Amino acid sequence: QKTLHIYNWSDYIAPDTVANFEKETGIKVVYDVFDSNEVLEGKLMAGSTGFDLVVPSASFLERQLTAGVFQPLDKSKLPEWKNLDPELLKLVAKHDPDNKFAMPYMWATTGIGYNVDKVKAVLGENAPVDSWDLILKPENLEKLKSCGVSFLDAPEEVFATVLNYLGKDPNSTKADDYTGPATDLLLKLRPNIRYFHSSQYINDLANGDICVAIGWAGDVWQASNRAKEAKNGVNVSFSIPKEGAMAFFDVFAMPADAKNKDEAYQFLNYLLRPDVVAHISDHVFYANANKAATPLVSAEVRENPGIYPPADVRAKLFTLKVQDPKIDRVRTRAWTKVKSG
């Protein structure tokens, strides 16, 4: 009896994907979920993960490769690798040279999710929902406190977003940028932030319990769809702000000590099927990395410029870089100050 252990982000697969794979292959899948790159990286660095497949963001995988925690993918066992978009492969290869270890799964941006009606009520019809000003100017966040604010519990993403907003290199190597301006601004915003969390904000936006969030694009579009299906009158939207935003590429990778390698390759080749992954995108509102799948994706998802953004918006996106120990120290120390402010 073959088994397969998979660790993926929460809210990142269609409801029937695993069952359909089990039915086709006779493999039993053990599926577990996380909402933090830090949790996954900690598990990878502390010992065996016990998983056959894990799904880091590519910028985290970039440094994880150098610790030897992954084994290279046997492309001879991934015949339809060909379906993957070559331009996305090239971007991911900046993190994973020659695409040896990582299979691109989904990608999106770190932007602003918000309740349309509540934000306009508080900040007026002309609320700047196209700008990080909406949530990174203290005067606006003090007012939005009235209906609830959440930030992601994602330190590398939040500091890069703040640095970009301040006109600094999103990947600044100047320690003073973190300890000075970035911390100063975050500590001014902190009293108005209800919580730091990277998954509770989906249902809280959908149900009207918060009105604005730093969020991952497809998560917010899921919240919007859950609100529509509830017929609760909640109108949620998402913005890639005008100052730019961070892009991420989530990738499947195989732990070096994976027990069930043959089954893992079966699952990866299953995900490379254009109809399988288009069906996932249809349900999670994330762009997949599979060029053959794009026309199969629902018009609702494929034509949303907050999911598949056009070239002029993609040109404004930035990605995370590896930092040295000093910046890791000052960034992490500053993050701890902010979450307890």
Ligand SMILES: [Cl-]
């Ligand atoms: Cl099962």
Ligand SMILES: [Cl-]
């Ligand atoms: Cl929840």
